[PDB]
Design a protein around this ligand. Structure first.
Ligand code: NAD
Ligand code: NAD
Ligand code: UPG
Ligand code: UPG
Ligand code: NA
Ligand code: NA
Ligand code: NA
Ligand code: NA
Ligand code: NA
Ligand code: NA
Ligand code: NA
Ligand code: NA
Lengths: 338, 338
């Protein structure tokens, strides 16, 4: 298939692109490089075993989007582009709504213009809001995210749903990611956060690599087995693979296909720490800090639907998620070159 | 004050502009004329007794917005611009999200750029969603609107709220309108819908003027006194006046000020019909049709907050709302000239 991958040079998009190329699709990456570097492109080509086309541009540029879609005769679009720092979003709402809500609107409008009606959106478990019923199931009604970031994702899901209602031939997948971690097995590609990492794993990795002193565990008083937060960590490769399948199976299948993408099991902060200590052969230093604003105690996905409907399920373990991250972190301490 | 009135040539904006000019503020209207005509400008000037500045442009044009705000040293902005046909919104979601969500985002971003932090947004009772508790009070949590239009308004309220959180010096009023009707007493200005009117009053007026055969009453089986839908109709002049006060009193008052704007009482479809028959001296023809999709049975505002805090309350009656509309409709059967 001819697929446009927005945000294709980012963390999850890069991994998905390698998988797409492996399944022999023709990939065109669209990224503005605000959060990634061109240095990854060669790696994606190599690991993918095929050349993906790269266009530096912004999803907010509707005219460019339209031209791209036509010029490359795109069949389907995978939309990972956007801003995603939760904390930042609170301090800078406009930027989030613009890049995520308007960004997606400009892209789908371009799609409409170019007659492209196959779409896959990067959504997030935050859309469920403060849902006491766990695991989270797709049929649960959505909640109210507590940040501009989460609200921006929910708003896009709403808009896409309404778009489909109005243009029923559209096939739109809302892929709600859980907690993506891990890296390509080669250890040549991985998450490359600039500045302080906001997520657990990368933070751990930086402490482990000697860049940071101790990991601050946000809260030790939650109602969980060990008192620390619990989440559903999913390997970036399993996510990559899930996007490939979603894209292949759902193309031309009209509707709004919602799927949780996670392992379907929860792991606490200590569990992750322990898994990393084991992978890097030394104890990861850590300390207990206060609860982080907005954090829910525990949640994980109910991923049976993607299993049943797409025959998709995670295959990598927590150990591998820790090991693969350690490998990349260790093999590329300075991340992708400038 | 120096105020930028977006959508100033439209129905409610035009009336508000006359009131602003009467209170001697300097008004600059920004409208794209997609739903109004330049022919109203002279009328606004005359009735306002002062010349308002007019700029044809679109709220989605951030660069223009910014230039305008600076060039005219704006102090506060009243945002009525947007698309508002509920039914249309369902058939054409993108246009609604673009003009209403992105439209507002581009405007406030321009505001941020030009250092303008006083804002008034045209919101709507739909934001309360399917709220069984009536009347609706500002402290009730928001619900889920059933159309792209209502969702677009709720999304903007969310974005504006988050913007304020991040830029605490902003004074932002979310004015939730109920059912605006009526026209300037002169009968020289009023609502000028193009095509079939979606709202009750205008529809009635067109039947009354002989343009339409009968009024279709959507549902006669609701759980209301008379079986017809019940709403809180508010005279466009009282709304105009309420915006003037809001603007004067809230300027420079940091926060998110939410106020319901309505009469605080409900009237059924028959009540309105009867009031119009009386005003036009003949029976308005009507018939019973099936419930209109998405319609709630009955709701009205609890407008005590605006009373208490802004010392604002409606002063026009239902009769006057019917009479003033009949007057305009009758004095200008073809609406504003081309
Ligand atoms: N990593 C996570 O924990 C997480 C959880 C759920 C949802 N998501 C979503 O998945 C998507 C991919 O996440 P990721 O971890 O790979 O992030 P990332 O930052 O590594 O990838 C996003 C990419 O989009 C690009 N980009 C940003 N704004 C753009 C714009 N306006 N136009 C064009 N390119 C733009 C960035 O340069 C980057 O390469 C995002 O939408 C993210 O919100 C990820
Ligand atoms: N009339 C109602 O029943 C109702 C109820 C609640 C909320 N509102 C809101 O109040 C506001 C004013 O409503 P109204 O009845 O006067 O509508 P209107 O159509 O008469 O006024 C809106 C004006 O905005 C202009 N406009 C539209 N999109 C624009 C854009 N992108 N840039 C610049 N100008 C643009 C139109 O030309 C029009 O003059 C709207 O936002 C409406 O949603 C009204
Ligand atoms: O330095 C750190 C970082 C994280 N945590 C804890 O680690 C767990 C995971 O935290 P983090 O990696 O920040 O994950 P989330 O808060 O779950 O957020 C991610 O997962 C969500 C879906 O589950 C998405 O909505 C978000 O965009 C994505 O960043 C939580 O209990 C955090 O309290 C710490 O104790 N210390
Ligand atoms: O031809 C018509 C038109 C309307 N109605 C009834 O009249 C009442 C008022 O209907 P309408 O004028 O369309 O009002 P709303 O549906 O209440 O919607 C208006 O009021 C809302 C706030 O209350 C806003 O959210 C909307 O944008 C605005 O159009 C309702 O019970 C309708 O069922 C009829 O029976 N026949
Ligand atoms: Na339709
Ligand atoms: Na960063
Ligand atoms: Na320590
Ligand atoms: Na680096
Ligand atoms: Na802040
Ligand atoms: Na019309
Ligand atoms: Na009849
Ligand atoms: Na006319």
């Amino acid at each position: 298939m001819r697929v446009l991958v927005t945000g294709g040079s980012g963390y999850i998009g890069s991994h998905t692109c390698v998988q797409l190329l492996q399944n022999g699709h023709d990939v065109i990456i669209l990224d503005n490089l605000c959060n990634s570097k061109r240095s990854v492109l060669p790696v994606i080509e190599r690991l993918g075993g095929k050349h993906p086309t790269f266009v530096e541009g912004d999803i907010r540029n509707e005219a460019l989007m339209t031209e791209i879609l036509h010029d490359h005769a795109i069949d389907t679009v995978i939309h990972f582009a956007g801003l995603k720092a939760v904390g930042e979003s609170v301090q800078k709402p406009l930027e989030y709504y613009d890049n995520n809500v308007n960004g997606t609107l400009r892209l789908i409008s371009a799609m409409r213009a170019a007659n492209v009606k196959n779409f896959i959106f990067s959504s997030a478990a935050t859309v469920y809001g403060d849902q006491p019923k766990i695991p989270y199931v797709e049929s649960f009604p959505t909640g109210t995210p507590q940040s501009p970031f989460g609200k921006s994702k929910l708003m896009v899901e709403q808009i896409l749903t309404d778009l489909q209602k109005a243009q029923p031939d559209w096939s739109i997948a809302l892929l709600r990611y859980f907690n993506p971690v891990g890296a390509h097995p080669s250890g040549d590609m991985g998450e490359d956060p600039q500045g302080i990492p906001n997520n657990l794993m990368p933070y751990i990795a930086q402490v482990a690599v000697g860049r940071r002193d101790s990991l601050a565990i946000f809260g030790n008083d939650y109602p969980t087995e060990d008192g620390t937060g619990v989440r559903d960590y999913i390997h970036v490769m399993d996510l990559a693979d899930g996007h490939v399948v979603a894209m292949e199976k759902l193309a031309n299948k009209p509707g709004v296909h919602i799927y949780n993408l996670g392992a379907g099991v929860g792991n606490s902060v200590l569990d992750v720490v322990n898994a990393f200590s084991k992978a890097c052969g030394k104890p990861v230093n850590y300390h207990f800090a206060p609860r982080r604003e907005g954090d829910l105690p525990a949640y994980w996905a109910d991923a049976s639907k993607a299993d049943r409907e797409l025959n998709w399920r995670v295959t990598r373990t927590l150990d591998e998620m820790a090991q693969d991250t350690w490998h990349w972190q260790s093999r590329h301490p300075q991340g992708y070159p400038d």
